[PDB]
């Protein structure tokens, strides 16, 4: 995860949501330093364990309730349990990654500091801060009104048939855990989008400074080679930090994209109220947007990294000095060798192609289950 | 999309079908210039919106009609809605690509002009114009008689049980939108086939001029290197212009190849008239041909681009001059680096392998659905 | 397809089976010449058309017979029609490839002649002839007793309930077409195995002559580079000749591996005679062996082609002369560039990985269909 | 398989379990020599044949018993037969690989001896021996208590309804064969983990000795190039030795991960005793751990092999001598050329991506079968 004074609200939100128990303390030479927060580590572990235990306790309390609200069936129980358990797994993986990842975070931030140090000409900070804050605020607000609307529609259905108020607020830990899931998505989307933006700036350096004695050109070549190595290693560091968390996030998103669609189809077939149908449509849209927050930044970063050698050849021809050509040859050898694709801890490569495979899964399941219903 | 006086009827047809609101005006130095047509942009947006609203209005009017003609079932409604909605999505994506794509079209045509400028020896214009016009006319005619036959068979079935004339002409916007889909297929097939033909000419240059002082050979090497870069970038420009349109076209084609087959199987099982069965067989053949108009040109272009280094090695050995060998080394470095595969906006690579995967999908669905029917 | 005096019986059998209407006439300078046989081309087209029409006529005659023997059901009809039609498609594709492939065959044989010309030290002809003749004889004999056993078991079942003799010999064209399918498999297996054996000899040249003035070493380097180009181009020529025929062969083999397994499962569930069960087990084994006659030779050829640069590096280090090192550098550049994987006309790459995918299909279908039966 | 005095207990256990009929005899010059044990080869073949015949005899004896214990159904019979037969196939493949693999084992051990000879600085033997012995003991113990618990729960269920003691001990050969399967897993996990650890040491050599006259640096470069070749060839030797055994192990693991899950779901639906449910949960966990003993070591080895050129570039820049740079260029050419991914005899590449595909299979089957049950 990325820690910087460009956008420190994201780090504070992640720490609040028990996903980054860290401390951001400066020294005199700038260089924001990330240290382990022992007071916040125990807070994160306690909050994660308490929230998971609470949502599971509410889950089995609804299951054992006299009139169940959310899980009253042989199949509704299984699907609701799968949804809650996959959300719990995503939360636990995010907390585990944020806890035992201090060294990876420190190394990634140290590399990013040197990356930003030599990217001055197109280092526009205000726009980056505004974009990051807007993305975080929009994500938190959309999930806030989504959880509020979900509470409202479930309250409406429960009151349709202490009545049910405690039965429906038994899922408050579930929505609190959804909040932590949104925070984890915010963190990963910020880090990957920052890596992609730095790759864009790296591509821009060679695109404008060269395709427009002279040892400054050789210095720029060496600095950009170091920058491309640092970005390629930062992608690997991110894959070490949130690789399994992103895997479980993708699994949760696929499971939700299947289960919410199945619930919407069943509810439409039963010819019930329009509120639950609209809420499930909003949930499907939100799940699609959530999926377009992990595959999209990784795809952008990989595509921008791949677009460096294709411009490096241009300097390879548009050079005459015997030293700068050798330097560009080394850079070309790098880009022939380097590969900066995000990996979900080695199981899969996160990019837009997943969007196809997920569909190839969903269009399968939605073809099977529906045909079993009718 | 490609604009040239070699075949200007395709551009005029695309502009008529609300898919290319552009103006082709020359200057004195040849160089056909493509400008944004503000009068035609509003016409395109109005036609697209009106056509989509009209086909949807007819869709729900048939659904709410006293005796529905095309959608009278719980499953027929869903499948017909899926077909109409996927056609609508393809049309909307094509219009959106043709509207917000002026810069990409201008850059692609500017690059293609320089490509054709230095490909004189095998620049045969009359055959290219005849082939493009024949392909466009055949596509439009086949879809015309197909829509006419579909109107006829649906009229026959509707009259089998204002009677039904307004109910059956409620789908005239649907067939008008199918016409725009055919026009979009024509446009993409023309552009991709032109890129492939230029790749073939590029391969022919090095295949005949070298495998048969002398600085003309070095000049030809440099010109062909520039040509291969321009073609590789033109493939990327096309992937930027029609990348998502081709994705939605492939999705529509897969959905139709499944739905038309399911309808044919159901209709054969019900033992009804032979006209609808033959019309659906023709529709399946047309959908297969439509699929063999996006994967086929992209596959041809990629295969012809891949067949350049495999001939570049021949000059790499069949050269003696110290400068021409270095030039061929740079060209070889390009072809080792370059990749000219069309991408459907990053989700998938369009080639003949899709034909396999589509089958692996269809043979799945046609195995499931049929087993659910029997 | 490969024509040589090393094994001319395979070519004669292929010509007899309407799969190679060619003439093998020598000139004084050795160099067996393949010419188009106009007398045999019309024979091949007539035999193919007559056989296809005859098997289809018998198919619909059994379907319309008073007591059908092989197709008396709603599903048995469909599965039997699929089997017969896929066999017919394979036969038609093989005949079409053998007819409009004179130029490809001539070029492939011309390249193979030069390949064998400079592979003298390990050119062992008697073993190659014996292996090819044994493979062809074993394939023909196994299919002969398989068709005989199939005739016997179907006669037994038909007589269990002109009685049925004409109804059961209505499928004699089907088994005659199976004979042509076996001949096509023999042809492709001979050609691909010859390409693989020549790749093995090429790998052996560099493995023994170098890893054991001296311009003979440079001559050997140049000759082996030419040989590797000729083999890589011969693989492409074979992919042009039998690319679609191999695709339809793989489709037929997958369809048969599914259908025969489904029939065996159904017959075991019905608790009928053991003869049909054993015949279907033999048919499944034969279909598996048939599949291990297209993926196996292509996989062997690709694996042996890939094992050339991995030994080329050895000479790259074990050389001292400034000219031989440059020659080995060119050879290494080839093997870095070259790719000699057989392609089924671009849809898929034929290798052992298909064996996995086929299973991933079969284990799917055999899981679905069976669960639908019980 | 790896034979060394570092861990000789694994070899002795494998020989005892009829998976390595070899003899480890030293000569005076160290260099542990592996010879074929004719006394142990016949013992291995007899034990394998007797065990397979015994488990099959017990299988059909339970099937033909008056009151079947494990297979009393139309589907339970099929699933139990599939499990037992896939275990038998894995055992037979392991025995066949261990018998006809003397040359491959000898070559692999000879290469590994030279690998370990020049890896002295980080050659820590005590930790390697402790880790290997602990892994083997833990695997054997976990499978021992698992088979004991399985015997106990099956005895409990059988006594719930000579009573059944001989019927339940009719599966003692099945659990004895499971022991041999565990031994095969131990052998492959030891060999692949040793290859990965040697790759780690190779990566460490260049990571510490260079990234910290001088011909010792060139000597180290040459030695590490030879080491990387030897490791790449040792991976190929392992793929030759246990390639098909690992394929059948993966097939068995997938079949078990599906069948045990189906049994657990059915047993939970039937609302039976908790002991069988907990035993099946333990079996699922053990099968997952077994799967994380073939994909995990191969993935680690491939990932560590891929992390060599990415550090080789560092010496490529951090060198000044004209000879050491040329040596590093040759090493870079290797790592650009080399590929050290384990292959299951060419059908598939064993890595963590399989974990995804297996899930994509399981999540399919568990979606189908369950929907067929309800
Ligand atoms: O409660 C929120 C979660 O449960 C569902 O609403 C099920 O209807 C899912 O769509 C969503 O992920
Ligand atoms: O109306 C044309 C469209 O609707 C169908 O005819 C359904 O029968 C499809 O085959 C076709 O794509
Ligand atoms: O007639 C031979 C063909 O038909 C079947 O026997 C069906 O039982 C198939 O197994 C085989 O391919
Ligand atoms: O007997 C052990 C084997 O049989 C099962 O227990 C079936 O319940 C499997 O889980 C296991 O692989």
Residue numbers in the entry:
A (entry chain B), B (entry chain A), C (entry chain D), D (entry chain C): 1 to 161, 166 to 216, 263 to 424
Reported in the publication:
Among different sugars tested, e.g., 100 mM maltose, arabinose, glucose, trehalose, and fructose, only fructose activated DmoGr43a, with a measured EC50 of 42.97 ± 4.69 mM and ~30 mM in electrophysiology and calcium imaging respectively. Fructose, a pentose, adopts a conformation that its five-membered ring is roughly perpendicular to the membrane surface in the fructose-bound DmoGr43a structure. Accurate modeling of bound fructose in DmoGr43a was confirmed using molecular dynamic (MD) simulations, where fructose molecules remained stable. When glucose was placed in the densities, they also have a high probability of stable binding in the pocket according to the MD simulations, in line with the observation that glucose could bind but not activate BmGr9. Binding of fructose in DmoGr43a is achieved by formation of hydrogen bonds and hydrophobic interactions between residues in the binding pocket and various groups of fructose. Notably, Arg 70 from the S1–S2 loop, which is disordered in the apo state, becomes well-resolved in the fructose-bound state, and travels downward for fructose binding. Residues participating in fructose binding are generally very sensitive to mutagenesis, as most mutations rendered the channel non-responsive to fructose at up to 300 mM concentration. In DmoGr43a, Phe 313 from S5, which is directly involved in fructose binding, moves ~1.6 Å towards fructose, together with the whole S5. When the protomer structures of sugar-bound DmoGr43a and DmGr64a were aligned, it shows that these two sugar molecules do not overlap with each other, with the bound fructose molecules positioned closer to the pore in DmoGr43a, and the bound sucrose molecules in DmGr64a positioned further away from the pore. Therefore, sugar-bound structure of DmoGr43a and DmGr64a are likely in desensitized or pre-open states.
